[PDB]
A paper describes a structure:
Choline-O-sulfatase (COSe; EC 3.1.6.6) is a member of the alkaline phosphatase (AP) superfamily, and its natural function is to hydrolyze choline-O-sulfate into choline and sulfate. Choline-O-sulfatase (COSe; EC 3.1.6.6) is responsible for the first step of this pathway, consisting of the breakdown of COS into choline. Like other arylsulfatases and phosphonate monoester hydrolases, SmeCOse is a mononuclear metalloenzyme.
The COSe from S. meliloti CECT4857 used in this work presents a single L105F mutation with respect to that protein (Genbank Accession No. Based on other studies showing the necessity of high sulfate concentrations to inhibit hydrolytic sulfatases, we used concentrations of sulfate of up to 200 mM to conduct TSA experiments with SmeCOSe, showing a of 0.8°C. On the other hand, only higher concentrations of ammonium sulfate (up to 500 mM) produced a slight decrease (a 15% decrease) in SmeCOSe activity. However, our structures do not support this hypothesis, since Lys102 is at a distance of more than 4.0 Å in our sulfate-bound and HEPES-bound structures. Nonetheless, Lys102 is at a binding distance to FGly54 in this structure and might assist during FGly regeneration (see below).
Residue numbers in the entry:
A (entry chain A): 5 to 512
B (entry chain C): 5 to 510
C (entry chain B): 5 to 485, 488 to 509
D (entry chain D): 5 to 485, 487 to 510
Write the structure that this text describes.
Amino acid sequence: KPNILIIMVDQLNGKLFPDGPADFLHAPNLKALAKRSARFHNNYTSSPLAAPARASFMAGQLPSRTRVYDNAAEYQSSIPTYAHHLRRAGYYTALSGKMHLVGPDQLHGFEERLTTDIYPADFGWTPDYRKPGERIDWWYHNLGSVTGAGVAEITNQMEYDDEVAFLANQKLYQLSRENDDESRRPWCLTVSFTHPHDPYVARRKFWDLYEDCEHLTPEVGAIPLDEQDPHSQRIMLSCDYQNFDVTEENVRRSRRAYFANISYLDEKVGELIDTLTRTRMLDDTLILFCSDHGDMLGERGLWFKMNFFEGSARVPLMIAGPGIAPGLHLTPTSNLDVTPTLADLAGISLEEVRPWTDGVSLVPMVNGVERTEPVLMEYAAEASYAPLVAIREGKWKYVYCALDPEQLFDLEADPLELTNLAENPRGPVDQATLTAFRDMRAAHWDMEAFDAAVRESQARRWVVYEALRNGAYYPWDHQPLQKASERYMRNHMNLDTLEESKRYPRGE
Amino acid sequence: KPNILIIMVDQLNGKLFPDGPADFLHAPNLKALAKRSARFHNNYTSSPLAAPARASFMAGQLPSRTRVYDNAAEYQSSIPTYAHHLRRAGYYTALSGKMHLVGPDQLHGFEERLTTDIYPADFGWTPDYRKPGERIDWWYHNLGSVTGAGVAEITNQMEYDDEVAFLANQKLYQLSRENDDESRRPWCLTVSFTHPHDPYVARRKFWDLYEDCEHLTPEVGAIPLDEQDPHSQRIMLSCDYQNFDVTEENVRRSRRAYFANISYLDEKVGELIDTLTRTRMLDDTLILFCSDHGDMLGERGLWFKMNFFEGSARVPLMIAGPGIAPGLHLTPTSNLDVTPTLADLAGISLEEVRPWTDGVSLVPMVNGVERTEPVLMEYAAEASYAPLVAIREGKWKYVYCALDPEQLFDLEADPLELTNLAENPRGPVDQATLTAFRDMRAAHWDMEAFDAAVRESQARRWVVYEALRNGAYYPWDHQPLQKASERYMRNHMNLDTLEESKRYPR
Amino acid sequence: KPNILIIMVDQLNGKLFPDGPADFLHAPNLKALAKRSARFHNNYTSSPLAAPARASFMAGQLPSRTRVYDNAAEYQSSIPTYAHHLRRAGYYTALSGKMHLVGPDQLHGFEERLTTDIYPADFGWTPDYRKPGERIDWWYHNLGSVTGAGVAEITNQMEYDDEVAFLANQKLYQLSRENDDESRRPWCLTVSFTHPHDPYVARRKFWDLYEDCEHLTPEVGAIPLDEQDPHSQRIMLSCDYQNFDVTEENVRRSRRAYFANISYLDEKVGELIDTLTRTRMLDDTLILFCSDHGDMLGERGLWFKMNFFEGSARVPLMIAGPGIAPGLHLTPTSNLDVTPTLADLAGISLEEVRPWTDGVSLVPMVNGVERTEPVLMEYAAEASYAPLVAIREGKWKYVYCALDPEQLFDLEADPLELTNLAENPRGPVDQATLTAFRDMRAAHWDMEAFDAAVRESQARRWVVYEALRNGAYYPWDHQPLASERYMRNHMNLDTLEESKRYP
Amino acid sequence: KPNILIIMVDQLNGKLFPDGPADFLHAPNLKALAKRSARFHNNYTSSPLAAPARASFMAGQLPSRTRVYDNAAEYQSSIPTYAHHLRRAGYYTALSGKMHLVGPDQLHGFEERLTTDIYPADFGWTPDYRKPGERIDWWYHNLGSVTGAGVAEITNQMEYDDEVAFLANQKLYQLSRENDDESRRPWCLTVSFTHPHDPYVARRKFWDLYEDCEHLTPEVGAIPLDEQDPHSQRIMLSCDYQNFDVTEENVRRSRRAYFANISYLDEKVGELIDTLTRTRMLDDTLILFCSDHGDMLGERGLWFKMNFFEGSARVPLMIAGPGIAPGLHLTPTSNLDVTPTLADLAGISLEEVRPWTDGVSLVPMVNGVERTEPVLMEYAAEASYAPLVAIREGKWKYVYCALDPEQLFDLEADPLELTNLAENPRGPVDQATLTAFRDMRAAHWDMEAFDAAVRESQARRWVVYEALRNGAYYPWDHQPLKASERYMRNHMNLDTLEESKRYPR
Ligand SMILES: [Mg+2]
Ligand SMILES: [Mg+2]
Ligand SMILES: [Mg+2]
Ligand SMILES: [Mg+2]
């Protein structure tokens, strides 16, 4: 059974990984990794928002099934995740970094978690479908990140990711001490970074890499409010766009710092692989690179996520290691597919995970078997007044919301999604295609039931959270475990035995 | 707004409270409390098992709604409980003792919890409908408690309840120091004891009180296996009855220690009343006495709970204090009613709690209003192979399981439930009654959907729990908070100001 | 004096022999040989092309010294080879199979050659540094081997190797009949197979062994032309890469047949060991296993050789038999070291071979003495426009061409050579290392003189070959040499049978 | 394009051809040929020994460039020769007879070779500069040929040359059958005889032609060892001079048989000319007469070659045929010039041969353009302990060896090379001349680098050749080719065969 190192980053636009990292990015370690990887060019989040994407990623289940509709929705501890599936199959499992789990369970199957979460674990960020058009300024996104972009040597997120990286490498070193043990458990370590998520603020060393960058403005620029589709209009309102003057310089500084923070992450990818190499674990380790959702990065005038356009919904996915054929795949894939893919790679039978996952294993695709299943996405959080769903199949993307006109995009003819074929069909094929997707949509979702479930979930939490914020607060944030009385040299141990057990490799 | 003291005990057969405590029980404090209480004689659990009853009790929702089907089912933290409702209305809320909450949330709205739980917080005790007939010896009930009944000066449960009682009285004393503060929050303290739940083992002092007891044998004796209804048969097999030789003396000793432990609790009730009296909080404090489920106590040959017979499904309920007219109420009520009753007593509008509670406030009842709503019960844990549901309305009890013959009892004519009218109707009224109950059951429950929901919950947990018991274990048990650097006299405080703030009355 | 059996194969990627054959290969005979061998994990060709590698192998001399720069360069008969060295010390020496010797001398010291060569002996395959960028389609490598991989029960190469094997085993039987006369010379037999060189076509029996194989794709995928280093770009045009559509199925079928052909060879290794065992010559016989160069096998998008990346430049080397302690050695070694190692094992003095070899004996090192000399490589044939040289020492590989950026790899940190530390050093030590390798390069090669000598050799041959392909062709192909075999009436009929019999 | 017939003989003293053959020689065919020839009176070998001279002759390159330093040195097959140059231009090229090519390549560009070589093809005759003063008796020259001169009707060499002649004439006839087919390639046939090389033994018919010969003793007689220049001393020690009593009679017998064997050869020249005439190819055919090196023939007391004196270093050179103006040329020329002359005569461009030849075409000289380039010679085989070089320019000859005193000769004033002007200069002109030659010598050769290259070549071959003579020997001698395709066979047309093999038709 191979080891599994999952490297995850937050808010990474998948279009920036056309075939591994784009040429213009300074990312040598991720480019070298990509050359060894199966690379999934058209990979999509299951939900363009942090907590919904991450609960779905861990479970291999859609938000409608996990019930994690938004960034404040409880994730039930009884829902199996890839950590349960691997741990049940004999893996040691650990998390360093972020997963935005909401509720008192901050492990969800992970045997050990090395850091707290950067974000809250409580019900604060609960949207309210009963009050459409409101925004909550103290947690909603706003374009202050765009006007505030720049250069700093420490930030909240760099403190977090610096520590995530250090503890991940320390854990790989600790795990190598078991390498000569016949009865060692294989390990699965998830390293989950908060970059390149905003604030768009970067260390000067990485900012300086992009002085001459040719990609600091999007090809598709700002669409005025009057000309936006309704959901995009709700996002602009939710971001308080009217109270910010986003200049071209602001767009350029934000994209520049974002690219710089990819380069910041690339250095951390190199450290992890160097640790794997020197500990002699690289040949037995699968490495997956993934992200929860994208960032529009100013394309269409939009920033951040919360929508199904390519920049928000596309996220990179790469897998490398024993038994994995390197190569590029264009068939659309989903983050929903990661958990069943990991289970398959770990030797777990299809039947053991079939009842618990909505995705499919990608391993047959890596081995030349055509994948046919469509890619499904959902969104039911801020800037929605009712749930949205999307279907990505073949060359098409279809988006449905009961409150909006449908969208239908031919991504091979129209990769920038500039012509809505549901409004302006090119011919009778486009009209027949729209009908097929409507049928597919009715097959997969009951939208009235979806809306009612989201409303009931919000209403529960508004009662409960108001109560929990009265009197003394009981926090749910993960506190990594204290072990000082059992670490290093203590006088209930054999002193020379200790040094030998903590040294690795041995006898050289 | 009044203070609220909830006194809860575990596994207390409600037939023992015909009008407050039965005369033969040595329970002067509970009898004194009962005389000033609204007493609900025919009060029922929502589910005859610890965790399902308690989650349903806290939320005012049935197990089919809480999803807490058994003793290992996760109780979601987003479900509102009476703690949340009161806390949202401005109450300080606290729990001392047991609530058998499963999952990493061990507060469920309680602002403070003073003890850990006596029982596990994890998914270990999960039944499996895919293996009907199996029992799990390491946690299932078994009749060893009947054959091992006796006397001891300390037990696991007396250690627990002794501590529950001390910390509750300590908290009342601490709360009295705020009495003179016009800006104080009113308080709601739940004090939840594990007795008289088995093992049936009592301190000598209380065991000696029942030397001449005349209720040491049940009136309805052991029904042989072949004559038992199918569910009772499933219970006997789950208790491993074949491997125990339960003598008449075992029955008497179990019941004697059980009664003694009611007397053990009565002493603790008096302590709490005494603390309320001397702190001058009694007259502003509502007092509720309740239990999660009953105990058959050998009636029909059965022990413990897990069924809808009277000894297992009946639990006492009493309410006393400001605005509560004393009196005995015979109309059937249930534990589902406690949470909306609490909200009502605390001045919370019916509209604020309507979407979150399946029961009804008993306040109107206390003030003379006739109550008509029926009482519903559910069971879907060990010794069931498919869910069971019950309906209690007027003089009738109806019990349904897809796999079993229906049961229908006229508790007015047949309070010991010896004649099943669904099998042996007395006439056309009994037949029409059965039909009315079938139609009403079919409108309230889809029992096939109920069964599918229970099986999914079990299967989920069997995957998850096996994983969580591999490698290092992460416990969810509640750990009461440690505040020693901020307690008593510390040198960041004014040392004479401290003594005055900690003194009361002043 | 021990007998010496040299088993050589063609185009075998040394990364497939990490400690003997890799576990995933079906090769029980080579795994059993390895277990009693000194095994040289990091052994390198001296030049990643057939004839340059083989002339250098035979002489223990680099191409810059043999002058065999490419696959059409004459190998002078006056250059001593290990066959001369052993033959001078009293050995009977013979070759069965391929050595790709160019020119009229097809023995180069071998007393007897049992087969012709599979490949040409003339100046046809001559490159020309005056036309940098051309390709010659009728003999250049091309990716048709990759798109044409598969299964067949006979091929040109299997016909050849079947015969190589038969005659080698026949010769071992013949050599066993002299095994009772103390007056008999020790023997050195070189058995040189053309597999696993492409075509990637295998017998179905061996193809079937790899249905479940987990290694049918390389560890590094195809790198687009624009992202390749300049020499890799030259190679990619060389094989006309743009005129082939290499699918993943093509990659898988090519690697599967290649592994199948390793298994095909393993059966022949087992046959040779069986003959040694049954004739009772095994215990007195040194066995060496070697190859001329590797095969990239689709790694980086490259096939075949002509470069210094691991898959092309690494080749296996194992030695077993009397006086050889088994073990795995990680210090880099060279095919250049085979000839002085053979001479040393044969009791020849160091001074007798010192003037004629650029490598070193590996025997001290089998016996625990640390080997410090670096490993040197050269390439000056097709897809080069000027000579390339490489140095392998410690954990490092350094590659220099006057026309290209340097390459520097740390193979312990970067075994797949995905980070060029000359362009992208990690820190100060990488810079100091690059400088030291530049100093070492200057101490070993005059690159201007190298290029001039290559150009003069190419130009000579272009004049000569045009002339030689006018009029009647005189072939140089070796023809092995009936009226003296078996029972003939000028011999003693009864005495003959007892002489042909053994034991 | 003209046909080309190269008639080559071995060890013919060039002073015997002062204007074609000397008057006293019975050589009517070679004198008839000479009269229609451009004749190069002062023509020199490139190296006074068989294999080195011949490899240099074939390549138009000096030994230091061919690497063929001695009679056992491998001649690499990748070195272009006039055979390659002509073959590349469309010629059929063939050799009948000797060329003393060493190594497994016995064609060196020739498309067909009609005989094997009379001498070995392997590394046997290798000198060793590490053993100066030693001699290897089983192949070194010795003066036994001088004492054993005489008369016989067959010899090894006459068997050989008889066969060379027969097959060469047979081949000319075969080539004439292609005359009427205007599609045929032009041909170049090299006919290379072993005479007048020793043994000095002749058929009685030719021996009787010199009964009254007046040139049976050399003008310059024997020089005693103690008065010889150091190289001549090394030659005498290597010929084992101390073990032979060479009488005046021995000299006369040797020189008589030698002249007789020139007459033996002249008969064969007549045969070739007669075949060309009767086949009607004569007018379209260039005829070149040449030799590899000379023979001292007793002059100065020396025999054979291995030195730069006139008798060993001069060889005849004549060219006749279409476009060749007859006449005598005195400017010094070199065997190095044959290959570029042949190429020029075949219409090959100057630039196609310039990188490959150290000599110059003689066609401009034939056509009245003065030639100025000097004549260079080298020697690095037996009787040398380090390489020797020589320069021949205008009237002068300069000889250098690092180990010996220089020699400088004014061949106009001193045609017999009796006065060494480097030791006994006549005045400042001789001194400035010597200095000019020193400077010239130093610009052309690094003699230490030359010595090192020779030593390495010797040392290589000592390792190899010992090996090759253990166990079964594999020979490199040329074996000429097919009887099942000759004459009348029952897959051909019988009436078609006779007509195609008949000529004239
Ligand atoms: Mg995110
Ligand atoms: Mg209970
Ligand atoms: Mg090869
Ligand atoms: Mg000669």
